[PDB]
């Protein structure tokens with residue numbers, strides 16, 4: 001007869017949203033174990049015990065007989081505390097209970113990518129659970145039990161070490177906006193027959209990530225049939241060419257250069273522009289000349305190319321780096337990518353062009369939203385945060401108030417003007433933003449696919465005092481068009497309207513309110 005040492009399960013720290021809503025919680029459960037040696041002295045209680053555990057009488061009997069010489073086996077794990085003491089009430093000799101915890105995710109698939117999960121051993125393996133594992137993990141206690149010759153538990157002798165709970169972590173996420181964002185992205189995925197998507201909502205003034213959702217997603221409370229594809233927090237860990245969505249930054253470089261002003265007109269006839277062996281092409285070849293604003297409204301590649309040739313790549317590269325494209329966010333989310341902003345010594349005409357209209361670089365959805373947040377925040381960039389922020393941090397002026405203000409105005413025109421991106425309009429509010437439509441990279445070679453696109457829309461609102469920026473990305477829609485302003489803009493409209501209402505933001509455009 002010896003003294004066995006056994007663990008005292010500790011509480012894992014609570015993860016909440018920014019308002020205290022539970023996202024990850026350690027819920028008390030009871031596991032039943034048995035001493036076969038003791039159970040063998042009470043065989044006639046078996047059929048009753050077997051039925052209380054929902055097991056076939058003979059199969060249960062087989063289990064115990066196969067482990068007869070043994071002193072410890074598990075009967076069932078993770079019952080409710082009531083279920084456990086219900087069975088313990090049967091007073092079957094050799095049946096014991098252990099009070100433990102199971103990690104439970106109340107929002108399930110809605111916040112799976114941000115939150116992640118713990119594995120069997122209670123260690124974080126994905127998402128925030130992994131990133132803050134040290135913080136969240138408690139330290140298990142220990143106690144001593146005396147058992148006799150036949151393994152029968154005789155006495156609880158002492159607690160050698162108390163258990164200590166993990167610490168509470170409050171995320172920057174607003175679960176209300178996360179629900180709204182999650183449902184709308186799913187709907188659009190399904191309407192459009194798309195393969196994947198992301199949606200990011202950011203507070204432009206504080207840097208707090210208010211929502212981050214992706215499709216495909218999964219249920220962390222039930223991972224039985226989980227495939228690896230569904231696990232990716234795409235918004236942070238997948239990179240893409242932003243296409244036309246970087247034009248407002250190219251345009252920001254232009255206005256900062258002293259060589260351009262909004263009234264300037266650019267001749268974009270014939271809608272192509274040969275340079276070398278490569279042809280810069282416009283998709284909407286309907287106008288012959290466009291002012292600066294009209295270059296954004298019609299999303300003219302030729303137009304932006306000509307401005308780019310005039311100002312040079314370095315000024316464009318510069319603004320893109322400054323707003324944080326291809327830069328480290330400093331969030332340290334597991335697997336998070338920085339993307340790439342190519343740095344050349346000599347910038348040929350083509351590479352200057354393709355950079356200015358958003359190819360040759362790669363960003364994440366979170367980075368894109370960050371850049372639009374800076375633009376919306378009168379040119380002041382603020383560090384990203386995925387945890388609740390108490391004090392509004394000190395920002396860095398990355399674009400002058402004046403340039404930012406002008407570019408905000410052009411983007412508002414992109415949504416509201418005739419021939420604009422009208423599906424992006426937000427009932428009740430003035431919205432600003434920019435669509436994008438980008439050919440996907442060829443599988444198995446260099447170059448681009450002729451029929452697979454990524455639909456983008458990026459923006460902020462309300463125009464008169466911007467509070468939130470948003471990025472909607474949808475991959476390979478195949479059912480109802482593929483242009484950014486057809487596919488992603490209506491999602492922007494719907495989510496933005498809901499978000500601003502949920503945040504009680506006063507409407508700034510009542511003739512369209514509800």
Ligand SMILES: *C(=O)[C@@H](NC(=O)[C@H](NC(=O)N1CCN(CC)C(=O)C1=O)c1ccc(O)cc1)[C@@H]1N[C@@H](C(=O)O)[C@@H](C)CS1
Nearest residue numbers: 243244283284299301359435436437438439448483484485
């Ligand atoms: C902004 O996103 C614009 N989109 C396009 O021009 C794309 N272009 C491309 O995907 N690519 C791929 C790679 N290269 C060489 C490296 C290119 O030169 C290039 O242009 C595009 C291509 C085909 C089709 O059918 C559509 C788009 C403009 N933005 C949109 C928008 O706002 O969503 C529109 C309305 C005009 S095209």
Ligand SMILES: [Cl-]
Nearest residue numbers: 336337338339
């Ligand atoms: Cl990276």
Ligand SMILES: [Cl-]
Nearest residue numbers: 331385386387
């Ligand atoms: Cl953070």
Ligand SMILES: [Cl-]
Nearest residue numbers: 240439440441
């Ligand atoms: Cl791609």
